[PDB]
């Protein structure tokens, strides 16, 4: 099973609305004032479905936790790919400047 | 209870029922990642920008946003000697078998 079920609770991508006005960052960030970051949440239940793209380590740990949960803890549902967003600010010359910020949005979730 | 860290994990392929194909090694040290991801996020946890933002939101309202997770961030391989379905002896390197570092994601 190396490489060289509670369906509703399975590890998945959920909403995470980041609001910069709530953080007090809106006298710095012009736009977006709110964005969909997402978050990963849910079970990493043996046997793991293909789309959760477990590492070989996660396959082993998942099985060990299934056989004895008191001895080995489960693998975790986390972002496995992230993408950037464009954030707008005012530069030194008072112009609106667009900047890309990396690893801001979940593109995929998986078990690790 | 404690900060996200690397802990011991002894893997025994015989206990897992995988000794029907793996010949060797039948046991190895894989490690595992366990613990809290909270502020202050220490340097060695190397949080992504997404994990910093999710940690911030969980701090502001833990009932609305859950915390990030302590997972392997670097892994190393092990080579396995095994018998396939056709009874052939195979030797292959398997990536991501041993946790080298943990972090918050």
UniProtKB/Swiss-Prot annotation, chain B:
Localization annotation: Secreted; Cell membrane
Effect recorded for residue 94 to N: Resitant to NOG inhibition
Associated disorder: Acromesomelic dysplasia 2A: A form of acromesomelic dysplasia, a skeletal disorder characterized by short stature, very short limbs and hand/foot malformations. The severity of limb abnormalities increases from proximal to distal with profoundly affected hands and feet showing brachydactyly and/or rudimentary fingers (knob-like fingers). AMD2A is an autosomal recessive form characterized by normal axial skeletons and missing or fused skeletal elements within the hands and feet.
Mutagenesis or variant effect for residue 18 to R: In SYNS2 and BDA1C; reduced interaction with NOG; reduces affinity to BMPR1A; impairs BMP signaling through BMPR1A; impairs chondrogenesis
Quaternary structure and interacting proteins, as annotated: Homodimer; disulfide-linked. Interacts with serine proteases, HTRA1 and HTRA3. Following LPS binding, may form a complex with CXCR4, HSP90AA1 and HSPA8. Interacts with high affinity with NOG; inhibits chondrogenesis. Interacts with high affinity with BMPR1B and lower affinity with BMPR1A; positively regulates chondrocyte differentiation and induces SMAD dependent signaling. Interacts with FBN1 (via N-terminal domain) and FBN2. Interacts with TGFBR3.
Gene name of the record: GDF5
Name assigned to this protein: Growth/differentiation factor 5
Its biological purpose: Growth factor involved in bone and cartilage formation. During cartilage development regulates differentiation of chondrogenic tissue through two pathways. Firstly, positively regulates differentiation of chondrogenic tissue through its binding of high affinity with BMPR1B and of less affinity with BMPR1A, leading to induction of SMAD1-SMAD5-SMAD8 complex phosphorylation and then SMAD protein signaling transduction. Secondly, negatively regulates chondrogenic differentiation through its interaction with NOG. Required to prevent excessive muscle loss upon denervation.
Positions of disulphide bridges: 4-70, 33-102, 37-104
Effect of residue 79 to N: In SYNS2; reduction in binding affinity with BMPR2; no change in binding affinity with BMPR1A; no change in binding affinity with BMPR1B; decreases induction of SMAD1-SMAD5-SMAD8 protein complex phosphorylation; delay of phosphotylated SMAD1-SMAD5-SMAD8 protein complex nuclear translocation; strong reduction of SMAD protein signal transduction; reduction of chondrocyte differentiation; strong improvement of chondrogenesis; decrease of NOG binding; resistant to NOG inhibition; no chondrogenesis inhibition
Portion of the full sequence shown: 397 to 501 of 501
Family membership noted in the UniProt record: Belongs to the TGF-beta family.
Tissues in which the UniProt entry reports expression: Predominantly expressed in long bones during embryonic development. Expressed in monocytes (at protein level).
């Amino acid at each position: 099973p190396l490489a060289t079920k509670n369906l509703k609770a399975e590890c998945s991508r959920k909403a995470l609305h980041v609001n910069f006005k709530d953080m007090g960052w809106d006298d710095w960030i012009i736009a977006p004032l709110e964005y969909e970051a997402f978050h990963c949440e849910g079970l990493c239940e043996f046997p793991l479905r293909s789309h959760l793209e477990p590492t070989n380590h996660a396959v082993i740990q998942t099985l060990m936790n299934s056989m004895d949960p008191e001895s080995t803890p489960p693998t975790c549902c986390v972002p496995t790919r992230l993408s950037p967003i464009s954030i707008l600010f005012i530069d030194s010359a008072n112009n609106v400047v667009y900047k890309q910020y990396e690893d801001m949005v979940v593109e995929s979730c998986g078990c690790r």
